[PDB]
């Protein structure tokens, strides 16, 4: 048989053995499953198809064993499961076909797709409060404390710059400095978040998915114990588990950090204008937040350890820095050594943090202080998986708390899967979680060979001036292929919308196309610094799925007038 | 066998007079002896049989034996003997002042001029702007720069910034309360100051790049001679080995009494010394709706009179959606055509006039004449080629029924050393980026001997209506007409741009996208359509999908950028069933 026949057979059949040619331990398998009154269906895989099948399930020798549509590997893996007693518990009936731990981007996407394929699904979501005590509804990081509130506050900051544009285009706006009222913005954002929480809660109920607002821990091979807000503990059993627990803001081992500094978990529901703010960190979260806080008129400082946007093209990173500097954000090469609280916040006004730094001159080191209203700790995001009981169900984790996959299947446990941010090496983006969820569900319950494509994923950093990208940085391309084999085509431009204004952005917009010279200027990556970078980058990202060349960009006809057409017309080679 | 295409075209670019023949060759000693008459060497090439059909397709001729003159494809012997017998060949083979004369200083003309001169050729560019009926005139850059896309997009942005002022309030910006008016004079000066900078830019760019600019209207007075007249009425003579016609079009006026006296055009709208006030837009083209749209957005009372359908050529589903939205935004649409325009007041000193517009309306008894008073009437019923006074008869360049030049690609079908690009080229889509690409590419064929062709299919557009409409490829109707309803899948969704989520905008109920797919070829994408803020920025990249025969599966395995409107193309599942 071919692949799809094998995977379909595997999805449908309760226990399937996939073989190339007659091997001794197939009898041993028959005899072992005979022990449990189980019937072992078999398939002669054709030799034309072995390699493909082996690559898809991510195992390296041929004889393959499936249990309830989950790939276990070979005999050693099976005998391990049997010897551990797991197989005996696995073969029993359970309450749910699938239990999902996490009600975020991935969780909810998986839940919706599973139930559309007619499976009994439970979804567990619980939000342990931040250190400041902040908590929120269903939907996960993106909905409550991630992309959706951040984009709204970015739009607030842009509408600031639009008010001034409106004057240059002839709109007679009554004279007077205009201030943004934090309470109005925050209520407007929180009201939308509240509508999405209800939306998801409804969507789950409407689709016959069981929701439990309860924090889940493995207390058995196929048993989660789940604790709700009241402290009530229930037991949930299932034939399969999806871990989509995501991450939480990282705090450093520094005195006062956890006492004095807020995180993105807290910023989007603050009962006060955060005032003179310090953003600690160089991640996209620090710069996005610093950006909009400046745009709504706060005094903003960013303290970075060494470089901005580690992982991103450093040319583009330096360009974001020059621009946000021109827009009045202060950058400083420090890491605080202590945070001291001077004033607690009220329900209407912010507090005061004293921030301690070591500063050098040519004569020695000074301990130096500086008083900020609010300090945003934004250095990263970690997996909080210590209290999940992954030891109980023998799910290996990386040094960080992230789960180690064979694709999305736990590398060590065949009926536990992970997607989204907690999957070791998964890019931490909402649309990736969703696609991983939707696609996994289609492999598990449909027996398709469809794989989430984790390469050449487009991003946008929503800095005051937006940065869109897909593919290699100029550095990575040069490191992997030589300098001699890379062409960079690039250009500056002025968005027409800015032409009649005196905006600082007129001197900062830039795009570059990274091309492999010795393979017909094949496009390895592209990068653009512009209004609406995300709207522009999305479509152009499909070019990389087809091994597009520069010639393909040059024979594409522009829409005039747009920023996007600039990618149609590049001729200048960087050095 | 013998030579392949690029060797032939390279040989043709380099050699003064080339004869390209197949394994098989006809009389073509007569031709040799003909060019021997002119002290010429006739270089020859055995084209390989592997290459004949390609080469024939590229130059757009049907028989094998091919003759080239000064890097121009003439056809076969009949065409050559015709040129000889007409005396043209004798004049062609002489030296001329310029390698190339370009008639038109617009999108195509200037693009061609820059590309020719980069390939080290002596080029003259001629541009003159005959005033509108109201007397309006403008500088270098053509329609786009002065009276087309550049001023239009700025006035659109003015209209959007209107809706942004209100958004700013819902996001918490404390804007002092009280109606906000847009001051027409400020907007118009801001636009005209930008146009002035582009005018200057282009004029300088030409001087810096060693291109001769003459602000003179050009007419063919010889096989290889333009006579050109400047503003002062001074007439000069310009000769060249080749000519590029990039004359563009001008607004159409109807044979209706008072139309030309009373109604402005886009030629006049962008420099009006007055707020146009209560406006009538006559026409259903993108020009009428774009202008009606921004005039509404800056707070004018706007009416659109359409003969029959909006945006003929465009997807009528999307057209009806634009109508419903612009209706919700206060634009009045009427199925009427004026039968007379009567001027009541002239525009004087920073104020508009009053036009009385006459219509036939039926009531419960029959048809009556009805009048209605508008401040300004924008005649926007299309654009025509004004090629009657160009002397194309003199150089025997065939024109279509409209004034447009008939091409064998961009070569005049009838004269081998005259070429046309942009709006005046019969069947060329009328867009700035097409003109530019046609110009740049032609120049690379003519002076480099490359086989590169401008790609005139699957061209993305955006209509900059109050809510922007972006598209590429077939409409739902065209796809159904060509393939059949049983073989078409239409995937579609509504969505709310996050930027609108906390507002009470009308647009929240109107944003829509659809993907038109050929069911029996793995949902191959024939077209896509989106109604959204920033439709142009979204459509551009997605348009490259159609250069690779993208399937729906390609859109589904593309990972979205969240949150953007664009990602909606990544997660379409709903099938339209009417
Ligand atoms: C400030 C910020 C801005 C961002 N901006 C963007 C952006 O613009 N675009 C973009 O694509 N991505 C963005 N991201 C990333 C995006 O939010 C994540 O990639 C995405 O939310 C990951 O979703 P997930 O399903 O993996 O996890 P989450 O959304 O974190 O879902 C996990 C859920 O599981 C719950 N949970 C944890 N443990 C348990 C347990 N034991 N039992 C039950 N429930 C549990 C958690 O409380 C949480 O609700 C941003 C992230 C942040 C923090
Ligand atoms: C209101 C409006 C909005 C538009 N919006 C868009 C849009 O958003 N996007 C887009 O892609 N396209 C748009 N277009 C179309 C675009 O302007 C044209 O497609 C483009 O300008 C055509 O370029 P061209 O070189 O063919 O002609 P033109 O730009 O018209 O250039 C012709 C020039 O030659 C001059 N000329 C004419 N005859 C002679 C002669 N005998 N001797 C010398 N000079 C002569 C003309 O006066 C003119 O200066 C718009 C058009 C209009 C009218
Ligand atoms: N004399 C006239 N009076 C009123 N409307 C007219 C007109 N001539 C053209 N139009 C309209 O003005 C627009 C532009 O004319 P066009 O000839 O450039 O359009 P098309 O793209 O159909 O070739 C069309 O909406 C057209 O309506 P019809 O499609 O019914 O012709």
Nearest CB to B537: which of A431, A536, A543?
A536
Please choose, from the candidates A128, A124, A100, the residue with its C-alpha nearest in 3D space to the C-alpha of residue A386: A128
How many helices (H) and strands (E) are present in chain A, helices listed first?
17, 28
User: What is the SS3 assignment for B450?
Assistant: coil
Domain covering B460-570 assigned CATH 3.30.390.30 in the classification: yes
Q: Please, is B472 exposed, middle or buried when counting C-beta atoms within 10 Å of its C-beta (0-12, 13-18, 19+)?
A: buried
Ligand 2 contact, B109 CB (< 6 A): yes
Map tokens 């050699």 to a residue: B15
Q: Which uninterrupted H or E stretch holds A533?
A: helix A533-541
Q: Are A76 and A65 within 8 A, CB to CB? A: no
Q: Which residues from chain A sit within 8 angstroms of residue B174, using beta carbons?
A: 178-181
Q: Same topology for domains A3-91 and A250-380, yes or no?
A: no
A289: number of Cβ within 10 Å: 26
Q: How was this structure determined?
A: X-ray
Residue of B nearest to A460 (CA): B561
Q: Is the CB of B425 under 6 A from ligand 2?
A: no
Catalytic residue selected from A192, A323, A527, A560: A560
CA distance A351 to B531: 46
What are phi and psi for residue A358, nearest 5 degrees?
-95, 120
Nearest to A41 by CA among A74, A75, A5, A65: A65
B378 C-beta closer than 6 A to ligand 2? no
Nearest CA to ligand 2 atom 48: B142
Right CATH number for A458-568 from 3.30.390.30, 3.40.50.300, 1.10.150.110, 3.40.50.720? Answer: 3.30.390.30
Report how far residue B209's alpha carbon sits from residue A127's, in angstroms, rounded to the nearest whole number.
65
- For residue A146, list chain B residues with Cβ-Cβ distance below 8 A: none
C-alpha A553 – ligand 2 centre gap (Å): 24
Residue B468, sorted as left (phi over 0), alpha (psi -120 to 50) or beta, turns out to be beta
Extended beta strands in A20-102, E state? 41-44, 64-67, 70-73, 98-101
For residue A41, give every residue at least 6 positions away whose Cβ sits within 8 Å of its Cβ, in sequence order, or none. A9, A13, A14, A15, A16, A17
Give the span between the Cα atoms of A140 and A434, in whole angstroms.
Answer: 12
Active site residue B562: yes
- CA distances, A191 to each of A182, A271, A423, B200, B482 (Å): 14, 14, 31, 51, 48
CA of B145 to the centre of ligand 3 (A): 24
Q: Which residues contact A494 (CB under 8 A, 6 or more apart)?
A: A506, A509
Cα gap A355→A339, rounded to integer Å: 5
- In CATH, the architecture of A3-91 is 3-Layer(aba) Sandwich (3.40)
- Which is nearest to A162 in space by CA: B552, B227, B165, B85? B165
Strands A41-44 and A467-471 come out as: unpaired
Yes or no: say if A147 and B562 are a contact pair by the CB < 8 Å rule.
Answer: yes
d(CA B373, CA A489) in angstroms, rounded, equals 56
Distance B254 CA to ligand 3 centre (A): 10
* Burial tier of A235 (Cβ tally within 10 Å: 0-12, 13-18, 19+): exposed
* d(CA B250, nearest CA chain A) in Å: 19
Task: Please calculate the CA angle B82-B86-B89 and round it to the nearest 5 degrees.
Answer: 80
Which superfamily does A250-380 belong to?
A: FAD/NAD(P)-binding domain (3.50.50.60)
Q: Which residues contact A446 (CB under 8 A, 6 or more apart)?
A: A11, A117
Which residues of chain A does B548 touch, with a Cβ-Cβ cutoff of 8 Å?
Answer: 546, 548, 552
Contact list, A538 vs chain B (CB under 8 Å):
538, 541-542, 558, 560-561, 564, 566-567, 569-570
- DSSP β-ladder status, B524-531 and B469-473: antiparallel
Q: Which residues of B touch A441 (CB under 8 A)?
A: none
Q: What share of chain A is helix, strand, coil (3-state, %, to 5)?
A: 35, 25, 40
- How far apart CA A223 and CA A99 sit, in angstroms, is 10
Q: What are phi and psi of B146, to 5 degrees?
A: -100, -40
3-class secondary-structure state, position B345: strand
Resolution (A): 2.8
Q: What are phi and psi of B230, to 5 degrees?
A: -95, 175
CA angle, residues B39, B41, B47, in degrees to nearest 5 = 150
How many angstroms does the Cα of residue B131 sit away from the middle of ligand 3?
Answer: 23
Residue with the nearest Cα to atom 1 of ligand 3? B254
Contact present, A121 and A96 (Cβ < 8 Å): yes
Q: Name the class of domain B5-93.
A: alpha beta
Helix H, strand E, coil C: the string for B97-161 is: CECEEEECCCHHHHHHHHHHHHCCCCEEEECCCCCCCCCCCCCCCHHHHHHCHHHHHHHHHHHHH
Pocket of ligand 1 from Cβ distances under 6 Å: A 101-107, 124-127, 140-142, 146-147, 150, 215-216, 244-246, 264, 285, 388, 420-421, 428-431, 433; B 562
Q: What is the distance between the alpha carbons of residues A553 and B540, in angstroms, rounded to a whole number?
A: 11
Task: Indicate whether residue B385 lines ligand 3 (CB < 6 A).
Answer: no
Residue B134 and residue B276 in contact, taking contact as beta carbons nearer than 8 Å: no
Answer whether B338 contacts ligand 3 (Cβ < 6 A). Answer: no
Q: Is B430 in the pocket of ligand 2 (CB under 6 A)?
A: yes
Q: Could you tell me if the CB of B263 is within 6 A of ligand 3?
A: no
Select the residue of B173, B564, B571 nearest A535 (Cβ to Cβ): B564
Whether B517 and B525 have beta carbons less than 8 Å apart is answered as: yes
For a ligand 3 pocket test, name from B381, B384, B403, B430 the mutation site with the most ligand atoms within 8 angstroms of its C-beta: B381
Dihedral angle, C-alpha B343, B346, B347, B349, nearest 10 °: -170
Question: Checking DSSP bridges between strand B212-214 and strand B123-126, what pairing results, if any?
Answer: parallel
B319 CA distance to ligand 3 middle (Å): 15
Nearest-CA distance from B357 to chain A in Å? 30
The closest of B238, B275, B160, B145 to B197, measured between CA atoms, is: B145
Interface test with A, best of B172, B553, B570 (most A CBs within 10 A): B172
DSSP, res A512: E
Distance CA A195, CA A200 (A): 9
Q: How far apart are CA A556 and CA B13, in angstroms?
A: 26
User: Does the beta-carbon distance from A538 to B498 stay under 8 Å?
Assistant: no
| The CA-based dihedral angle spanning residues B315, B316, B322, B327, taken in that order and rounded to the nearest 10 degrees | 170
Give chain B's length: 578
Considering B325, B492, B529, B562, which one is annotated as catalytic? B562
Whole-number Å distance, alpha carbon A126 to ligand 1 midpoint, is 12
C-alpha B399 – ligand 2 centre gap (Å): 18
Q: What does A280-348 look like in DSSP terms, one character per residue?
A: E--SHHHHHHHHHHHHTT--EEEE-SS-SSTTS-HHHHHHHHHHHHHTTPEEE----SEEEEEE---SS
Residue A124 and residue B295: Cα distance in Å, rounded?
Answer: 53
Give me the residue from A180, A535, A545 closest to B558, CB to CB: A545
Chain position carrying tokens 């200027």? A521
For residue A166, the surrounding DSSP H or E stretch is: helix A147-168
Separation between Cα atoms, residue B292 and residue B297, nearest integer Å: 9
**Atom 31 in ligand 3: residue holding the nearest Cα:** B307
Looking at the CA of residue B283, tell me the nearest atom of ligand 3. Answer: 12
Contacts of B110 in chain A (CB under 8 A): none
User: What DSSP element (H or E) covers A445?
Assistant: helix A430-446
> Which of B347, B367, B210, B370 has the alpha carbon at shortest distance from B269?
B347
User: Which CATH fold topology does B252-382 show?
Assistant: FAD/NAD(P)-binding domain (3.50.50)
Alpha-carbon span A107 to A438, nearest angstrom: 10
Q: Is B171–A183 a contact, with Cβ atoms under 8 angstroms apart?
A: no
Q: Which of B96, B104, B121 is nearest to B211 (CA)?
A: B121
Residue B260 tokens, joined: 């030309």
Report residue A16 as tokens. Answer: 């399937």
What are the chain B neighbours of A496 within 8 Å (beta carbons)? 150, 153-154, 157
Distant-in-sequence, close-in-space partners of A93: CB < 8 Å, separation ≥ 6: none
CB distance B562–A142 less than 8 Å?
yes
- Distance, in Å, from the CA atom of A353 to the CA atom of A454, rounded to the nearest integer, reads 41
> Does residue A556 contact residue B543 with C-beta atoms inside 8 Å?
yes
User: What phi and psi, each to the nearest 5 degrees, are found at residue A56?
Assistant: -60, -50
* Interatomic CA distance for residues A129 and A266, integer angstroms: 10
């Amino acid at each position: 048989s071919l692949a799809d026949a094998v995977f379909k057979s595997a999805c449908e059949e309760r226990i399937l053995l996939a073989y190339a040619d007659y091997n001794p331990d197939m009898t041993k398998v028959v005899n072992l499953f005979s022990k449990y009154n189980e019937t072992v269906n078999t398939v002669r895989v054709s030799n034309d198809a072995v390699k493909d099948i082996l690559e898809i399930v991510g195992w390296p020798s041929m004889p393959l064993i499936f249990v309830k549509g989950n790939c276990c590997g070979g005999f050693k893996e099976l005998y391990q499961l049997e010897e551990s007693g797991f197989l005996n518990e696995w073969l029993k009936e359970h309450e749910y076909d699938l239990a999902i731990v996490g009600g975020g981007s991935g969780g909810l996407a998986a839940a919706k797709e599973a139930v559309r394929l007619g499976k009994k699904v439970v979804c567990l979501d619980f939000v342990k409060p931040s250190a400041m005590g902040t908590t929120w509804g269903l939907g996960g990081t993106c909905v409550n404390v991630g992309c959706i509130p951040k984009k709204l506050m970015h739009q607030a900051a842009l509408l600031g710059e639009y008010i001034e544009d409106a004057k240059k285009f002839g709109w007679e706006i009554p004279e007077g400095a205009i201030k943004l009222n934090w309470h109005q913005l925050k209520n407007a954002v929180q009201n939308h978040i509240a509508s999405l929480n209800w939306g998801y809660r409804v969507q789950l109920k409407e689709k016959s998915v069981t929701y439990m607002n309860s924090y889940a821990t493995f207390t058995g091979s196929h048993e989660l114990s789940v604790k709700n807000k009241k402290g009530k503990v229930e037991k949930v059993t299932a034939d399969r588990f999806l871990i989509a627990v995501g991450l939480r803001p990282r705090f450093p081992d520094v005195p006062g950090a956890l006492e004095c500094c807020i995180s993105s978990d807290d910023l989007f529901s603050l009962p006060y204008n955060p005032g003179k703010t310090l953003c600690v960190g160089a991640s996209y979260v620090s710069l996005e937040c610093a950006g909009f806080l400046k745009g709504i008129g706060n005094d903003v400082t960013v303290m970075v350890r060494s470089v901005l946007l580690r992982g991103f093209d450093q040319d583009m990173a330096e360009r974001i820095k020059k621009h946000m500097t021109e827009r009045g954000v202060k950058f400083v090469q420090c890491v605080p050594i202590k945070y001291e609280r001077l004033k607690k916040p009220t329900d209407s006004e912010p507090g005061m943090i004293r921030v301690h730094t070591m500063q050098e001159d040519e004569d020695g080191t000074k301990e130096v202080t500086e008083d900020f209203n609010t300090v945003l700790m934004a250095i990263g995001r970690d997996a909080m998986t210590d209290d999940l009981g992954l030891d109980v169900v023998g799910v290996n984790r990386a040094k960080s708390g992230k789960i180690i996959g064979r694709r999305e299947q736990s590398v060590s446990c065949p009926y536990v899967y992970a997607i989204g941010d907690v999957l070791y090496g998964s890019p931490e983006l909402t649309p990736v979680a969703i696609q991983a969820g939707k696609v996994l569900m289609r492999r598990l319950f449909t027996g398709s060979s469809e794989l989430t494509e984790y390469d050449k994923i487009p991003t946008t950093v929503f800095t005051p001036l937006e940065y869109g990208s897909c593919g290699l940085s100029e550095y990575s391309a040069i490191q992997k292929y030589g300098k001699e084999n890379i062409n960079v085509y690039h250009n500056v431009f002025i968005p027409l919308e800015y032409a009649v204004t005196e905006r600082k952005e007129k001197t900062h917009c830039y795009c570059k196309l990274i091309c492999l010279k010795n393979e017909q200027d094949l496009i390895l990556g592209f990068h653009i610094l512009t209004p609406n970078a995300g709207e522009i980058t999305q479509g152009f990202a499909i070019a990389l799925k087809f091994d597009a060349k520069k010639a393909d960009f040059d024979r594409l006809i522009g829409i005039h007038p747009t920023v996007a057409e600039n990618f149609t017309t590049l001729t200048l080679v960087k050095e």
